Amino acid sequence: HFYEMYNPLYGSRLGVPDTLGGDPKFRSLTHEDHAIQPQNFMPGPLVNSVSTK
Amino acid sequence: NPVKSMWSEGATFSANSVTCTFSRQFLIPYDPEHHYKVFSPAASSCHNASGKEAKVCTITPIMGYSTPWRYLDFNALNLFFSPLEFQHLIENYGSIAPDALTVTISEIAVKDVTDKTGGGVQVTDSATGRLCMLVDHEYKYPYVLGQGQDTLAPELPIWVYFPPQYAYLTVGDVNTQGISGDSKKLASEESAFYVLEHSSFQLLGTGGTATMSYKFPPVPPENLEGCSQHFYEMYNPLYGSRLGVPDTLGGDPKFRSLTHEDHAIQPQNFMPGPLVNSVSTKTGLSTGTSQNTRISLRPGPVSQPYHHWDTDKYVTGINAISHGQTTYGNAEDKEYQQGVGRFPNEKEQLKQLQGLNMHTYFPNKGTQQYTDQIERPLMVGSVWNRRALHYESQLWSKIPNLDDSFKTQFAALGGWGLHQPPPQIFLKILPQSGPIGGIKSMGITTLVQYAVGIMTVTMTFKLGPRKATGRWNPQPGVYPPHAAGHLPYVLYDPTATDAKQHHRHGYEKPEELWTAKSRVHPL
Amino acid sequence: VGRFPNEKEQLKQLQGLNMHTYFPNKGTQQYTDQIERPLMVGSVWNRRALHYESQLWSKIP
Amino acid sequence: LGPRKATGRWNPQPGVYPPHAAGHLPYVLYDPTATDAKQHHRHGYEKPEELWTAKSRVHPL
Amino acid sequence: NPVKSMWSEGATFSANSVTCTFSRQFLIPYDPEHHYKVFSPAASSCHNASGKEAKVCTITPIMGYSTPWRYLDFNALNLFFSPLEFQHLIENYGSIAPDALTVTISEIAVKDVTDKTGGGVQVTDSATGRLCMLVDHEYKYPYVLGQGQDTLAPELPIWVYFPPQYAYLTVGDVNTQGISGDSKKLASEESAFYVLEHSSFQLLGTGGTATMSYKFPPVPPENLEGCSQHFYEMYNPLYGSRLGVPDTLGGDPKFRSLTHEDHAIQPQNFMPGPLVNSVSTKTGLSTGTSQNTRISLRPGPVSQPYHHWDTDKYVTGINAISHGQTTYGNAEDKEYQQGVGRFPNEKEQLKQLQGLNMHTYFPNKGTQQYTDQIERPLMVGSVWNRRALHYESQLWSKIPNLDDSFKTQFAALGGWGLHQPPPQIFLKILPQSGPIGGIKSMGITTLVQYAVGIMTVTMTFKLGPRKATGRWNPQPGVYPPHAAGHLPYVLYDPTATDAKQHHRHGYEKPEELWTAKSRVHPL
Amino acid sequence: NLDDSFKTQFAALGGWGLHQPPPQIFLKILPQSGPIGGIKSMGITTLVQYAVGIMTVTMTFK
Amino acid sequence: YLTVGDVNTQGISGDSKKLASEESAFYVLEHSSFQLLGTGGTATMSYKFPPVPPENLEGCSQ
């Protein structure tokens, strides 16, 4: 998967933990936190594409 | 004896490009076994998608394999130049781009270890043992390297490197089994069990060497200069444009334009573009998905930024990402506003959380407008800048082998984008089998043995030339963004330690990344 | 009809486009845009593959 | 025709046969006599159900 | 240094043949002694032939010798191609046959072991010690290799191989001594005590190499395509044959033949042949003998099969033999219907337990017939197929040096038949003698020492070309016979393990063997 | 086209046995399409047409 | 011709019928250019019966 190249077993750069002003920077879970895993690009161009409704 | 073996690092500039090249011992592990150990956590969440913590986001299940092969990375604009260096480069050349480069395994160690008579451990030099070594080249064995690693090139000299270990993420079967409402990732037809060992690679007894290299295909360069002039600020500083729009419909005049003013008008000739969210800090971060729980972050389109100060306030438009949070000798998982990107000109060109009026949608005299910081789709006639560079920096990453791919020139993280880059360079140790225990007892084990290689990468960048300016005004300078009295890239004693923000200072990065475009011309 | 893309495998069917915060209380007000996902600089993707039967080529205007 | 990429795939990788519906194989002739036991069909040659997918094979980008 | 030493495996196809070649470390034992230890159990039965268990079958007594020489095997169509590979081959070429091949001992280890001060064990690299190495070539030293081994090529990369140990079965004296009614095998004149050591072979200190090779003489190839048409189904689909036989004798008409029908007639032009038993599953298995207790099994004539489904029912006509019983990580001596041969076209051509009418033997109007599934002697004008192939597979075996030998083209097991094949490649370690114990004590022992070689075989098969067909219909496919959701040649996690047939899946063969003729033409 | 085939020298019926013999020689007529019926009526039929060839085989026996 | 493949025991409940399978073949002549042939034209071809034992044409007065 595009979003599945990354270091399967390693910690990315630095993610975003909470809010503004006083918000930490949870690096990343070794072996996990795949929601993070800063992707290097980002699929694009989608216009509607909603199932038969 | 002619063969002059040696430490290999430094870099030399030359009017049109430069050669960077470093070295770092490194140490191939030992892993008693090796089986690629398969993989499929079966959803790292509550199996499905309920709600309780910060790992229960389960971005669809996932597959994987952890190959005995430890590969290696250096993908950091970093290590190559070395600030005194980097700097230099920044002040003298208006552009950089990777030509090609090379890697060289040197003094091989491959020395096995047999522990003492119980007393301890005994490590001796061992020929016969060999550090397998294989370079991808062809490109079978899914990429990786370019995806944020926080586990690569030991930023600094005299700092061993025990390079990552190969593991990938195939795709295929997803079974909702286990409980009854529990999703798990499984192996499918369209799945791949890449088996390194099957495709000869070279061995490598002690002292031996090996090398390889490649040429970064062409590629636009990352300009290294500013923009002492705003996109929307070229125009006849003292003159009247064509004809503006004064009021409403049917009976609406055409106020030309105010000599010396009415800058809101000044019909711009283009219009910055591609903005998607980029709203200051107000899990889940401007990410596309499928089921609002199958997400995946992203430092977002390089079109926009993620830091800088509009004025005193160092925004961070969510999404974002920091390159190691300024810590004072301690790596704590949690540390707020600490050393993130830096300060773009992108701003100077309409790039932070900014409005996208788009006005009228059929209102009463242009009343109903709208505010879209989240929007600013791409319009034909764009323009703009990208997240510049930093001495530390994503350097280049594999684009995926997918059809059409609009402006794939750079790595989300900042490096270079290019299907086919510095092919992975795996190098596991070779399992020198053999009985272990007593004279009467057997044991088909992996005689202990590891290897200490001294890798040496070497890159070359086609430095463009610094543009020309009539600037009478000396133009900026160099020195890496810091915090007064706390100068980065040096050593402060832990003794007469910091008088204020207490710090032993065993060398430390700067606060906000080593900005790139620190210089400037006037587009 | 058509068939079964990898496009899916790469985020391509009716899928959400969070884009989160638009000035909410701690990133609460998000949004769900399957209809949207404008082109952003740094794309990637696949196209409707082929079929033995298949539109083969057509004049662009 | 470009050339088929290279893979370290130990796993035989997919196959061929055009997407169909079991017992009802496309691109062939079934007799209208001993016609379909289920979905009744004289079968005078018939396309497959879901189009002849393209990218039926695979590499690992 | 020019000498580039390395891992050696992979394979490359080429319009008319291909080169297969693999590698696997391996480890020469140590055997403190060596004396060929003679042999003669003196009947493994109740000495004679009474009745009580499943080993008391005593197939006549037997002789033997276990030489210090461990030889080596790779005789598996397997290891060479590697499914992704194999597969490929199967879909693109209508035939395979072994051209020739080669073997190469690489990185030699020959490192001795001297155990710690009691604390444990110490293994060091040792020159002076050498892995003897001898290749048969000439063919003295009775064969073996081709007879089912279940102890050969480590099917997979990164899987040491500690190759078999040479032992043979001479013949001669059979004494009915011991009790008074007890048969024992002894050594006769016509007996043979093959003494390896007597016929110089080469040594081999560390790092050294050695190689050899041979050319599989000519040999018919194993077609790799089906038969989209039945032997007995060529004929004028819509027309009347010559003249059939209607009733009895003297006054019996001659019903020509039904246009469009009477397929029972349709005088076939040949007639499949050679069937001997081949009756479904209803010790002792269709085996010839001498005294109904001096037997010996046999997967039987390759003329017939031993598995497939006539319809849902996967017969197994006794005799048979399975290539490793589908187990899920555990090798249990007993496991029913588990991964045996596969599904022939032989069937399609009259090959499973099928009747052999032969009708009249002097009855009343052709009443007394007979049913011979056990029979179907060879009749002049045969035709037929053989037990196809499987990625795993007997690859080739020595025919015996016996006069006349009808259709010895293939190994009962499926491989290739040929007096004179890949001469055995023995390689014992050399007994580096020497005192052991204390300073005052002696001990003419065998200083401990073993060696880890990295063998590399390489074969070449003259792939025929895929026949031509007017088939509009895409024709079959590839993917190895399996059991839905359980795909062979891959890794499933023992964690989110099988939802049904529970399996940790540390890579596993397919259920029914990797059928050969998976494709097809229309003879 | 089956593996091993003991004494396949002759046809059960008596002729000669040999994978690969006097390749079939097909020869259908070509469907010269075209309207049929009246001036106003159509009909995508197969204009009637046949052909009388005079085949000539020639063999040689050693 | 007579391809091979599927055999369904459908129709009644105890009734076997031959059907088309994967391993089946729908040979479509028209797909593989062959030559046409207006009137008067000709065409030919030929082949060599590979070697082959001959059918003796004599008895055995013994």
DSSP for D37-50 reads SSS----SS---SS
CA E389 → CA B40, E96, E305, E339, E490, distances in Å? 33, 10, 12, 14, 21
- Token readout for D59 is 């590499």
Q: Would you call B403 and C40 a contact, using CB atoms and an 8 Å cutoff? A: no
Residue B31 identity (one-letter amino acid): D
Residues 6 or more apart whose CB falls under 8 angstroms from that of E254 comprise E243, E244, E245, E246
| Residue E435 DSSP symbol | -
Q: Which two tokens stand for residue B452?
A: 């200490």
Q: Do chains B and C touch (3 or more CB pairs under 8 A)?
A: yes
**Which positions in chain G have a beta carbon within 8 angstroms of at least one beta carbon in chain D?**
6, 8, 10-11, 17-22, 24, 26
Shortest CB distance from A1 goes to which of B169, B333, B334? B169
Q: How far apart are CA E166 and CA E426, in angstroms?
A: 8
- Tokens found for residue F13: 């019926």
Q: Which of B44, B290, B321, B338 to mutate to test the interface with A (most CBs of A within 10 A)?
A: B321
With beta carbons less than 8 A apart as the criterion, state whether E110 and E122 touch.
no
Q: Give the DSSP H/E element, type plus range, for residue B122.
A: strand B122-123
* Bridge partner list, E390: none
> Is the CB of residue D43 less than 8 Å from the CB of residue D31?
yes
Q: Long-range contact list for C27-32, CB < 8 A, 24+ apart?
A: C27/A19, C27/B282, C27/B284, C27/B318, C30/B284, C31/B374, C32/B292
E371 neighbors E494 (Cβ within 8 angstroms): no
Dist. CA B337–CA E9, nearest whole Å: 52
Q: Which residues contact E51 (CB under 8 A, 6 or more apart)?
A: none
Contact B227, B347 (CB under 8 A): no
Residue E347 DSSP symbol: G
Report the SS3 class of residue E458. Answer: strand
Residues in chain D: 61
Q: Which of B459, B472, B475, B465 is nearest to B519 (CA)?
A: B475
- CA distances E41 to E44, E62, E147, Å, are 6, 7, 21
Q: What is the CA radius of gyration of chain A?
A: 15
Please name the residues in contact with B311: beta carbons below 8 A apart, sequence gap of 6 or more: none
Give the span between the Cα atoms of B346 and B385, in whole angstroms. Answer: 5
Residues in chain A: 53
Question: Three-class SS of residue A10?
Answer: coil
Of residues E390, C46, B41, the one with CA closest to residue A44? C46
What is the spatial distance between Cα E221 and Cα E94, in angstroms, rounded to a whole number? 9
Measure CB to CB from residue F18 to each of G29, G49, G54 and give the nearest one: G49
CA dist B482 → B298, B391, B485, E256 (Å): 27, 14, 9, 106
CB contact under 8 A, F62 and G54: yes
Experimental method: X-ray
Collect all residues of chain C within an 8 Å Cβ-Cβ radius of residue D52: 3, 50-53
Q: State how far the Cα of C5 lies from the Cα of G62, in Å rounded to an integer.
A: 79
Residue E16 tokens, joined: 């008319």
Query: Torsions phi, psi of E459, nearest 5?
Result: -115, 165
- Tell me how close the Cα of D17 comes to any Cα of chain E, in angstroms: 6
The three-state secondary structure class of E1 is coil
In 3D space, the residue among B270, B343, B359, B262 whose CA is nearest the CA of residue B310 turns out to be B343
At residue B90, what are phi and psi to the nearest 5 degrees? -60, -35
B201: nearest Cα among E89, E157, E453: E157
Instruction: Give CA–CA dist B513/B316, Å, rounded.
Output: 14
E278 contact partners, CB below 8 Å, separation of at least 6: E286, E300, E304, E305, E306, E317, E319, E351, E352, E353, E354, E373, E374
Nearest residue to A41 (alpha-carbon basis) of D61, B414, B77: B414
Q: Is E55 left (phi over 0), alpha (psi -120 to 50) or beta?
A: alpha
DSSP string, E327-346: -SS---S--SS-SBS---ST
User: Could you tell me how many CB contacts below 8 A there are between chain D and chain G?
Assistant: 26
Residues forming a β-bridge with B135: B425
Question: From the CA of D50, how many Å to the nearest CA of chain E?
Answer: 16
Residue B427 structure tokens: 């190098």
Pairing of strands E226-227, E520-521: parallel
The Cα–Cα gap between B162 and B38 comes to: 22
Is the Cβ pair A48, C38 closer than 8 Å? no
Mutate to test the interface with E, among B186, B199, B202, B428 (most CBs of E within 10 A): B186
Distance of alpha carbon B209 from alpha carbon E101, whole angstroms: 31
Rounded alpha-carbon distances, angstroms, from residue B79 to B153, B156, B508, E284, E448: 7, 7, 14, 74, 49
Across chain C, how many H-helices and E-strands are there? Answer: 0, 0
Residue E300: alpha-carbon gap to chain centroid: 13
Is E78 strand, coil or helix? helix
Q: Which of C35, C37, C39, C46 would you mutate first to test chain A, the one with the most A CBs within 10 A?
A: C37
Give me the count of residues in chain F. Answer: 62
CA proximity to B281, closest of C26, A27, C28: C26
Scanning every residue of chain B, which has its alpha carbon at the shortest distance from the alpha carbon of D9? B194
Contact B402 C10 (CB under 8 A): yes
Chain D residue numbers with beta carbons less than 8 Å from the beta carbon of B141 are 8, 60
Q: Which of B294, B430, F7, B495 is nearest to E407 (CA)?
A: F7
Pairwise CA distance, residues E114 & E122, whole Å:
5
Which of D12, D18, D25 shows the shortest C-beta gap to E87? D12
What are the φ and ψ backbone dihedral angles of B112, each rounded to 5 degrees? Answer: -80, 165
DSSP string, chain G: -----EEE--SSSS--EEE--TT---B-TTSS------SS----------------------
Closest by alpha carbon to E435, among E424, E425, E444, E426?
E444
Rounded CA-CA distance E164/E147 in Å is: 13
Is chain G adjacent to chain B, meaning 3+ CB pairs within 8 angstroms? no
Diameter of chain B measured on Cα atoms: 107
The answer to whether E486 and E52 have CB atoms below 8 angstroms apart is no
First to last CA, chain E: 57
The encoded tokens of residue E335 equal 């496991």
In contact, B136 and B423? CB cutoff 8 Å: yes
Token pair belonging to B257: 């334009």
Strand partners, F16: F10
SS3 labels along B361-393: CCCCCCCCCCCCCCCCCCCCCCCCCCCCCCCCC
The number of beta carbons lying within 10 Å of the beta carbon of residue B344 is 22
Which residue in chain E has the smallest CA separation from B33? E158
Q: From chain D, pick out residues whose CB is under 8 angstroms from the CB of G21.
A: 25
| CA dist., res. E515 & res. E73, Å (int) | 23
Q: Distance between CA E278 and CA E289 in Å, rounded? A: 18
Q: Which residue of B has its CA nearest to E114?
A: B439
By CB neighbour count within 10 A (0-12 exposed, 13-18 middle, 19+ buried), where does B445 fall? middle
What Å distances lie between residue E211 and B15, E130, E455, CA to CA?
55, 16, 10
Q: Using a CB cutoff of 8 Å and minimum separation of 24, what contacts does B307-314 make? A: B307/B340, B307/B341, B307/B342, B307/B343, B307/B344, B307/B512, B308/B341, B308/B342, B308/B343, B308/B344, B308/B346, B308/B347, B308/B352, B309/B343, B310/B347, B310/B352, B314/B512
Q: Which residues from E are below 8 Å from G when comparing CB atoms?
A: 226-230, 233-235, 237, 311, 348, 469-473, 475-477, 520, 522
> In the structure, do chain G and chain C come into contact, i.e. share 3 or more CB pairs under 8 Å?
no
In angstroms, the CA B298 to CA B321 distance is 9
CB contact under 8 Å between D25 and G22, yes or no, is yes
Chain C: residue whose CA lies nearest to A2: C10
Contact (Cβ atoms closer than 8 angstroms) between residue B148 and residue A38: yes
User: Closest residue of G to D35, CA-based?
Assistant: G11
Residues of chain F found within 8 Å of residue E349, distances taken between Cβ atoms = 2
Alpha-carbon distance B64 to B171, whole Å? 8
Give the length of chain G.
62
Burial of F19 (0-12, 13-18, 19+ CB in 10 A): exposed
Judging by beta carbons within 10 Å of its beta carbon (0-12, 13-18, 19+), is residue E20 exposed, middle or buried? buried
d(CA E217, CA E100): 8
Over the Cα atoms of chain E, what is R_g?
28
Q: Is the separation of the CB atoms in B306 and B298 below 8 Å?
A: no
User: Could you tell me the end-to-end alpha-carbon distance of chain G, in angstroms, rounded to an integer?
Assistant: 46
Dump strand ranges (E) for E216-355. 226-227, 308-309, 314-315
Query: In the numeric block, which tokens belong to residue B205?
Result: 């007894």
User: What's E146's DSSP letter?
Assistant: T
Q: How far is C26 from chain A (nearest CA, A)?
A: 6
Reduce the DSSP state of residue C30 to 3 states and report it.
Answer: coil
Written as one letter, the residue type at B332 is E
- Which uninterrupted H or E stretch holds E455? strand E449-461
Distance, in Å, from the CA atom of B275 to the CA atom of B301, rounded to the nearest integer, reads 8
Locus of tokens 């915090």:
B483
Beta bridge partners of F33: F46
Radius of gyration of chain D (CA): 17
Closest CA to B434 of E427, E452, E23: E452
Contacts of B189 in chain D (CB under 8 A): 13-15
Token pair, residue F44, equals 């995508």
Spatial CB neighbours of B367, under 8 Å, sequence gap ≥ 6: none
Instruction: Please give the domain boundaries of chain B with CATH numbers for all domains.
Output: 1-523 (2.170.30.10)
Instruction: Write down the residue that tokens 């295929």 correspond to.
Output: B172
Please give the helix or strand (H or E) that residue B89 lies within, else none.
helix B84-92
**Mutation to test the D interface, candidates G1, G10, G21, G28, most D Cβ within 10 Å:** G10
CA distance E368 to B297: 82
For residues E303 and E434, what is the distance between their CA atoms, to the nearest angstrom? 57
| Short-list B416, B417, B396, B121, CA closest to C44 | B417
Residue carrying structure tokens 């360069």: B221
